[PDB]
Design a protein around this nucleic acid. Structure first.
Lengths: 63, 63, 63, 63
DNA sequence: CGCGCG
DNA sequence: CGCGCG
DNA sequence: CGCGCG
DNA sequence: CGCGCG
C-alpha cells in the first residue's frame, strides 16, 4: 500500500529519527510489514537508515 | 484470532510436518503472524516443533 | 560496584543518550545489573532518563 | 554454565516447586540469569513450569 | 518488554 | 512485575 | 535468517 | 533480535 508507505513517512516527518518498533506500535501494523516498506522506501531514496553494530537501525526522511 | 489458529492447525492436519514458510504462503498471512500463533499453540500443547541446528523448525499437530 | 557505576557513566560520557541495551552489550554485564545501577545513579542525580510511552528509556549524564 | 544449571536443578531436587525468587536468593545469582537457565532447561525437558494468571511461574523437575 | 523490585 | 528477550 | 519478541 | 527475505 501507498497508504502504509504514506503513513510511515508521515510518522517520520513528525517524529524524526525512529526505530521500526516506534513506528509499528503507533501505526498498529506488523513490524515485518513496516520493515518491508522501510527497506523499499530506502531503495527509492525516500528514507534512510543509520546503523551501529547490532543496534536497532534508525530511520529518517531523506533531506 | 481463533480463526487464524484454526486455519494453521487445519493446514497442519492436511499436510503434516510443515515450515512456517509452507503455511503463510498458502494462508496468505504474514510469516510473523503465523509464527506468533505457532509458538502460542506450542505453549498450549496443540502443535510441536522439532529443530536441528539452524534449520527451519518443522511444525506438526500433537498426537 | 563503584567500578560498574564508573563504567556505565563513562559509557554515557562517550556516547551520550543511550538505552540500557546499548550499555550492557558493550560492558558485557547483565541488563538487570546495568538497570539497577542506572536507577541508583538517577536517584543520586548523576544520570537522568527521559521516557515516552512504552519506549526504551534513554539515559544520559546530568549536566 | 553447566554449573549454574546443575545448581538450579539441585535446588529444585531438594526443594520441589519453587519460584525464581526462591532460587536466585539461595544461589546468589541474578534473577535474570536464573530465569534464562530455567527457560533453557524447560526447552530441554529437564524442568517445567506451571502458570496461573499473572502469578509467579512455579518451577520443578520433570519426572 | 516499559522491569530497576531487594 | 508475568520478563526468559540475545 | 533460526526470529515468536509484545 | 540486527531480519527486510518474496
Amino acid at each position: 500500500e501507498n497508504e502504509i508507505e504514506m503513513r510511515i513517512c508521515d510518522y517520520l516527518r513528525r517524529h524524526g529519527r525512529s526505530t521500526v518498533q516506534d513506528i509499528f506500535k503507533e501505526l498498529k501494523l506488523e513490524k515485518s510489514t513496516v520493515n518491508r516498506h522501510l527497506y523499499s522506501l530506502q531503495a527509492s531514496k525516500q528514507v534512510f537508515k543509520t546503523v551501529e553494530d547490532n543496534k536497532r537501525p534508525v530511520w529518517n526522511l531523506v533531506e
